[PDB]
Amino acid sequence: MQILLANPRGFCAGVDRAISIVENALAIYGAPIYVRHEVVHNRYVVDSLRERGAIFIEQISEVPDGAILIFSAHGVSQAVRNEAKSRDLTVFDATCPLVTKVHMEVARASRRGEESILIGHAGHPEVEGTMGQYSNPEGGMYLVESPDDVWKLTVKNEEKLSFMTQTTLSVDDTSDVIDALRKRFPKIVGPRKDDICYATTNRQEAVRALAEQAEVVLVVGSKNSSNSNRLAELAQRMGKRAFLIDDAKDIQEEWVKEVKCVGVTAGASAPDILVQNVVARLQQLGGGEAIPLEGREENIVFEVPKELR
Numbered sequence: 583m584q585i586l587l588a589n590p591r592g593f594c595a596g597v598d599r600a601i602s603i604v605e606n607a608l609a610i611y612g613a614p615i616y617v618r619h620e621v622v623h624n625r626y627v628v629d630s631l632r633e634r635g636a637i638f639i640e641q642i643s644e645v646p647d648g649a650i651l652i653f654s655a656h657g658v659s660q661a662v663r664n665e666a667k668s669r670d671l672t673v674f675d676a677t678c679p680l681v682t683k684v685h686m687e688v689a690r691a692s693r694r695g696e697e698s699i700l701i702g703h704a705g706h707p708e709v710e711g712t713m714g715q716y717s718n719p720e721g722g723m724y725l726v727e728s729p730d731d732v733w734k735l736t737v738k739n740e741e742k743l744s745f746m747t748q749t750t751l752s753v754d755d756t757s758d759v760i761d762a763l764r765k766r767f768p769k770i771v772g773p774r775k776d777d778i779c780y781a782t783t784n785r786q787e788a789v790r791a792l793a794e795q796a797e798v799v800l801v802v803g804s805k806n807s808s809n810s811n812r813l814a815e816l817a818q819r820m821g822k823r824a825f826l827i828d829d830a831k832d833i834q835e836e837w838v839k840e841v842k843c844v845g846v847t848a849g850a851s852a853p854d855i856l857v858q859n860v861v862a863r864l865q866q867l868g869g870g871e872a873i874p875l876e877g878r879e880e881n882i883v884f885e886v887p888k889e890l891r
C-alpha cells in the first residue's frame with residue numbers, strides 16, 4: 583500500500599499563534615489561564631492545555647474576577663468582549679487576524695445602518711462572533727448557509743447591501759452561494775471573491791490533488807473542526823472513502839484492507855505529531871514510506887502579542 587501526504591496540511595498561521603498565546607500565558611502567569619471556547623478545535627491540543635492548567639469556558643460568568651482570559655482563535659462577539667471589559671479581567675485576544683479582518687467590515691456596515699449578509703454555518707463560534715459584530719437595529723445582519731437560504735431572504739434595502747463569509751467554508755459551495763446572492767441582489771458588495779482564508783483554500787486544493795490519487799483519504803482533525811470536515815467532505819464528493827479521525831487509534835483495518843493507495847491530510851488545527859502517528863499505524867497495516875505530494879509553499883506567520891513573548 584502506498585501512503586501519500588497532502589501538501590499543505592496541518593497547522594495554519596492563526597492556529598499556531600493562538601496555541602502559543604495560551605502556552606506563553608501559562609508560562610508567564612501560571613495556572614489557571616481561562617480561555618473562552620476551545621482555543622482551536624482539536625481534542626489533542628485542548629486536552630494537553632487542560633493538563634497544563636488552562637480552563638475552557640463558554641461564558642464570561644464562569645470566569646472569577648482578577649483572572650486572565652484568552653479569546654479563542656475563532657473570535658468573539660462585541661457583547662462578549664464588552665462583558666469581559668466590564669469585568670476586572672486581564673484579556674488577551676487569540677482571534678486569528680484573518681477573522682478580525684471580517685469583523686471590522688461587519689462593524690463598519692453596522693455603524694452605517696446598512697445591512698450585511700454572512701455566509702456560514704449556524705451555531706459555529708466564528709459565525710456567532712462575526713454576526714455579533716452587528717448591533718444597529720436600523721440595518722440588519724442575516725445568515726445564509728446555502729443558495730436556498732438566499733432564494734428566501736428579503737432585506738430592507740438591497741441598494742445598500744454587503745456580504746462576508748466564514749473563513750473555513752467549502753470553496754466550491756461558497757461560490758454557489760455568492761452566485762445566488764448576486765442574481766438576487768445585483769447591487770450587493772463584497773470582497774473580490776470571499777473571506778475564505780489562504781489555509782482553507784490551500785488545504786482544499788491539496789486534498790483535491792490527494793483524492794485524485796488515493797482510494798481512501800484520512801483527515802486528521804476533530805469532529806467540531808469546520809475546516810477539517812470540509813476536507814473529508816471534498817474527498818467524499820470525489821467518490822473516495824474519507825474518514826475524519828482524531829488519531830491513529832480511530833483507524834479501522836477494513837477502511838484500508840487491500841487498498842493500494844491511501845492518502846493522509848490534516849485540518850488547520852491538527853498537530854503534525856498526530857499525522858506521524860497515523861502514518862506509523864498505516865505502515866503497520868502494510869503501508870510503505872510516506873510520500874509528500876508537491877504543493878503550494880505557505881510562508882505567512884502571525885506573531886504573538888509582545889506582552890506575551
Ligand SMILES: C/C(=C\COP(=O)(O)OP(=O)(O)O)CO
Binds near residue numbers: 656681850
Ligand atoms: C480559528 C479557525 C480555524 C482553525 O481551525 P479550527 O478547527 O480550530 O476551527 P474551525 O475550522 O473554525 O472549526 C477559524 O478561522
Ligand code: SF4
Binds near residue numbers: 595750780781
Ligand atoms: S484557518 Fe485561516 S482564518 Fe482560521 S486560524 Fe487558520 S489561518 Fe486564521
